[PDB]
Amino acid sequence: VELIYKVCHANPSERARFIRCIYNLLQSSSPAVKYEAAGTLVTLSSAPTAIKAAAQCYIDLIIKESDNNVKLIVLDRLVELKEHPAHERVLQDLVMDILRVLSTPDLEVRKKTLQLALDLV
Amino acid sequence: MPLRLDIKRKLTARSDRVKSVDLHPTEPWMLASLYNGSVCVWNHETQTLVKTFEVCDLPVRAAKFVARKNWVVTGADDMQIRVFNYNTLERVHMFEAHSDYIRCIAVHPTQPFILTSSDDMLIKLWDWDKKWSCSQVFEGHTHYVMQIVINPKDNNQFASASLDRTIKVWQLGSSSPNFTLEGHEKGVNCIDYYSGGDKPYLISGADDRLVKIWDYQNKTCVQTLEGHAQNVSCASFHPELPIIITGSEDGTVRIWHSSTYRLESTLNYGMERVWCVASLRGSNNVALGYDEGSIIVKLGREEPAMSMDANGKIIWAKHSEVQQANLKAMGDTEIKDGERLPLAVKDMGSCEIYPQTIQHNPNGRFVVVCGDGEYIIYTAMALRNKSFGSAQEFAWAHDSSEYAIRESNSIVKIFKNFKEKKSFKPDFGAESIYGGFLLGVRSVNGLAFYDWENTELIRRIEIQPKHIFWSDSGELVCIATEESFFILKYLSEKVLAAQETHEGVTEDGIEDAFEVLG
Amino acid sequence: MVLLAAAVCTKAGKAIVSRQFVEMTRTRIEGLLAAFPKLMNTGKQHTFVETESVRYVYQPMEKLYMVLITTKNSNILEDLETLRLFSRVIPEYCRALEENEISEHCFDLIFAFDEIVALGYRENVNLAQIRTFTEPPINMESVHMKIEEKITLTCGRDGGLQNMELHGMIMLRISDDKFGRIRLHVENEDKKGVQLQTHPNVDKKLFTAESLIGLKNPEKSFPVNSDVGVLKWRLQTTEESFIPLTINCWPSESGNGCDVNIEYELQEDNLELNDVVITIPLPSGVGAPVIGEIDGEYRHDSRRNTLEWCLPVIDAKNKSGSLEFSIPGQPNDFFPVQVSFISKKNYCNIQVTKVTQVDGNSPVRFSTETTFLVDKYEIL
């Protein structure tokens, strides 16, 4: 017997069902910002660069939902980390620069990152 | 002498005598090497034990992480340093580091090297990349090499402490110690450097009850630290804070201010015989090895004290173009919001006390330096002594010519024009204070708001706060709470009838005078 | 089962010791464990790895794999947790994993496996547990009373009352000027079941004879919930409640087929019920029915396996039907018939004897109405 009216009431078991129940009550344009899904998810690619590369992808997606032309593919939500105020301190673009890569982190993360610079902006 | 501290027990673990304690070079984990023949590591932030390794069945004196390889080096009474992968859980390598058990290991992240110090009176070098071949052997020490540390200004240099009453500074290139320091008089248990790019320092600890500070640049002994009232097992330098943390076999740890060597604290735990110390290089965690276990402890000062007025005097203490003892700072710069703005400091006159908290007035007329149960008021931009007062805590309110203080008599105090207000004195007790117009005082699992009119209990909110700040109209308040945040309405008229009537209970209040807006 | 097997493996290419909870994976156990655990369960140093459509959870210990396998799953935390508890239990028996010592304590490990996971459902174990085993307008003044009640009944074919209970309330809607005191008089009630609630502003009066309740009514409509029984109560239909309908069922064995006659009886002929339906169930091997009824419409419904008779309004009436059945099996016991009905009376027998109002002249009790509804009304 699953689905609660509450937030919880306690314990890992209730907690595990709860992220399933949350995805129901907001399906809309992926989870966007991953819920209690995040904990199992890292181990799913323990070998080792692939986790960061994946993580980088989600973080880029999350920033904004742009036009979505050829390699401008960022989904998730339109505003939730914006892009580009001129009063924002120390700005969004600092994280965007990582994604522009020569190899600036390692090659698996690099391939993901170049696509990801292209994708947000 | 005063210093921002707050000793906190981050994680404890009970085990047979832990000779070495370490923080993981780049990870939030601390590794302790035990006499269980096991080394164990725990990440003392989430309170999860990440992994254990059974190095030997006889004590492991030393353990450290070579973070880049994702490996841990241990040296045990196998007279071996055995290497393991701390995520693929298996023994990476096994090698004989020495002819005797390995007291300490030091890791050079920039080079493939570990040098290990052993009580075969020799320190040997091993290169992890060669599969733990013996790169270099250092012959210099004629006694039991208790500890090794790498100098952070030249990693090619390390110092080793031996119970031979010297700490010898060696270079990798040279088997022999390229110079000797005679750092102690009853053998040197430990050597440490005071970390940084501009700090040439050594420390020696000895069983003459004493820790000694040495300057390696000048070669003189800067001062002698009382250490402990029994043989100093180890001594180390904290990087950020000006203190030395020492441990002794009397089960006591003492903290000494490194500016006059007057006792900052004495800590015992019911674990006793404190063998080692080590400090985190990124600062504010020190870990100490004891007979009955290990502890990882978290030191205070996490955040700076400063305040921005309307005169562009943004005042801090410490920092650049400002001294800690005196007071200064200005910030008149408006360069782009996207980066950190320059210091932009302009000089500011006299001070007489230490700044526990140092703050400008919110509209610029006063400066307050608070410190040692006293507040001293200095004038906004002239810094002549305006006023004085008592304050274990000082907070400007909204009024900022009325302020709240904790005078620590069990009543939260208001001082107005820096002169005490006794028309303000809670019918709660006190345990702590929140500023703003209705002073929040926390007592008996309550937050009580008091009037600056007759000090009656207006209301009590049943979730205690982090803060109360009141708007500059004093009808609206913003409450920082573990709840998250409240905005409350103080209905002024309702308060005037209630307060006069004193229908508001001594410790529970009247639930009408205040109302919960959101 | 959700958990096929719980298995200790050597990556020598064989299952060293293993447990088959119920006879399924005998030889199967060895081949799975032998191929997959050799490759680290095909893992990459990840606790969950799935290969050949079987979930393998594991932990490496030496050249050996302690392995849990599932091909179905109920929860994330659980699979790890049985493996984990297993990993506390296994060094007590074998001092880590190692094929020869694992081999010698087949019995120990195997017994723990049965105990830990029973019929594939992850029970819990512990090293101590293991031991036991191996051991002003007043012109307007008017008042209206509405008694709404539902009655429930369970009855035998014999007509045994079994259990019954009436639930109801009497709502009053009154337009009265001033504040008038009202006294309510009602019949006296008894209840096998229990429940009575009184509205505030209800006073209880003690009289030598007869019982009385008095109250100032709120204006408009409100639940009276007067004193006495109350004007909000659960009374037992058993206690003096009338059951508007009694059903007499006569099933008959026509032989191959079955003939069912259903008799319905109502209270006084004058009173008529409405919305009445009789649900007469039928057996699974239905064939088809032919039903005849003097009043209303009756229809057989497959799926429901019930014949439903509906009557808009009835003084009282009856129906009959003949059923055709293929006869598989033996005779089947009958299921109860249920009825829905509406009656313009309360069968809790609440009667409003008199409600006299004071503080003024006679008000008009324009109307008192009773709505009676069927609750779970079942008769076999």
From Swiss-Prot, chain A:
Domain of life: Eukaryota
Start and stop residues of the HEAT repeats: 13-49, 50-87, 89-121
Tissues with expression: Predominantly expressed in the upper one-third of the oxyntic mucosa and in most regions of the pyloric mucosa. Ubiquitously expressed including platelet, liver, heart, spleen, lung and kidney.
Subcellular location field: Cytoplasm; Golgi apparatus membrane; Cytoplasmic vesicle, COPI-coated vesicle membrane; Cell membrane
Function: The coatomer is a cytosolic protein complex that binds to dilysine motifs and reversibly associates with Golgi non-clathrin-coated vesicles, which further mediate biosynthetic protein transport from the ER, via the Golgi up to the trans Golgi network. Coatomer complex is required for budding from Golgi membranes, and is essential for the retrograde Golgi-to-ER transport of dilysine-tagged proteins.
Subunit comment: Oligomeric complex that consists of at least the alpha, beta, beta', gamma, delta, epsilon and zeta subunits. Interacts with CAPN8. Interacts with SCYL1 and PRKCE. Interacts with COPG1. Interacts with ARF1 (myristoylated); this interaction is required for binding of COPB1 to Golgi membranes. Interacts (via trunk domain) with ARF1 (via switch I region); the interaction is direct. Interacts with KCNK2 (via N-terminus); this interaction increases the channel-mediated whole cell currents and promotes plasma membrane expression of KCNK2. Interacts with STX17. Interacts with TMEM115.
More about this protein: Brefeldin A induces dissociation from the Golgi of the beta-COP and presumably the other coatomer subunits.
Entry protein name: Coatomer subunit beta
Portion held of the full protein: 228 to 348 of 953
From Swiss-Prot, chain B:
Start and stop residues of the WD repeats: 13-52, 55-94, 97-136, 140-180, 183-224, 227-266, 350-388, 390-425
Keywords, sorted A to Z: Acetylation, Coiled coil, Cytoplasm, Cytoplasmic vesicle, ER-Golgi transport, Golgi apparatus, Membrane, Phosphoprotein, Protein transport, Repeat, Transport, WD repeat
GO cellular component: COPI vesicle coat; cytosol; Golgi apparatus; Golgi membrane
Effect on the protein of changing R254C: No effect on protein abundance. Mice homozygous for that mutation do not display any developmental abnormality
GO BP terms in the entry: intra-Golgi vesicle-mediated transport; intracellular protein transport; retrograde vesicle-mediated transport, Golgi to endoplasmic reticulum
GO molecular function terms listed in the Swiss-Prot or TrEMBL record: structural molecule activity
Membrane topology: Peripheral membrane protein
Outcome of gene disruption: The knockout of the gene results in early embryonic lethality with no viable embryos recovered at 12.5 dpc.
Subcellular location: Cytoplasm, Cytosol; Golgi apparatus membrane; Cytoplasmic vesicle, COPI-coated vesicle membrane
Assembly mode: Oligomeric complex that consists of at least the alpha, beta, beta', gamma, delta, epsilon and zeta subunits. Probably interacts with PEX11A. Interacts with SCYL1. Interacts with JAGN1.
Purpose of the protein: The coatomer is a cytosolic protein complex that binds to dilysine motifs and reversibly associates with Golgi non-clathrin-coated vesicles, which further mediate biosynthetic protein transport from the ER, via the Golgi up to the trans Golgi network. Coatomer complex is required for budding from Golgi membranes, and is essential for the retrograde Golgi-to-ER transport of dilysine-tagged proteins. This coatomer complex protein, essential for Golgi budding and vesicular trafficking, is a selective binding protein (RACK) for protein kinase C, epsilon type. It binds to Golgi membranes in a GTP-dependent manner.
Family the entry assigns: Belongs to the WD repeat COPB2 family.
Protein name (database record): Coatomer subunit beta'
UniProtKB/Swiss-Prot annotation, chain C:
GO-annotated cellular components: COPI vesicle coat; COPI-coated vesicle; endoplasmic reticulum; Golgi apparatus; Golgi membrane
Subcellular location: Cytoplasm; Golgi apparatus membrane; Cytoplasmic vesicle, COPI-coated vesicle membrane
Sorted UniProt keywords: Acetylation, Cytoplasm, Cytoplasmic vesicle, ER-Golgi transport, Golgi apparatus, Membrane, Phosphoprotein, Protein transport, Transport
Superkingdom per UniProt: Eukaryota
A Gene Ontology BP annotation from the UniProt entry: retrograde vesicle-mediated transport, Golgi to endoplasmic reticulum
Location, primary (coarse class): cytoplasm
Family annotation (SUPFAM superfamilies): Second domain of Mu2 adaptin subunit (ap50) of ap2 adaptor, SNARE-like
One Pfam family it belongs to: Adap_comp_sub
Membrane topology reported for the UniProt record: Peripheral membrane protein
Keyword presence, Phosphoprotein: yes
Phosphoserine modified-residue sites: S362
Location of the MHD domain: 140-380
Matching InterPro entries: AP2_Mu_C_sf, AP_mu_sigma_su, Coatomer_dsu, Longin-like_dom_sf, MHD
Disulfide pairings: none
Positions where N6-acetyllysine occurs in the chain: K178, K220
Assembly: Oligomeric complex that consists of at least the alpha, beta, beta', gamma, delta, epsilon and zeta subunits.
Function: The coatomer is a cytosolic protein complex that binds to dilysine motifs and reversibly associates with Golgi non-clathrin-coated vesicles, which further mediate biosynthetic protein transport from the ER, via the Golgi up to the trans Golgi network. Coatomer complex is required for budding from Golgi membranes, and is essential for the retrograde Golgi-to-ER transport of dilysine-tagged proteins.
Family to which the UniProt record says this protein belongs: Belongs to the adaptor complexes medium subunit family. Delta-COP subfamily.
Protein's recorded name: Coatomer subunit delta
Taxonomic classification: Eukaryota, Metazoa, Chordata, Craniata, Vertebrata
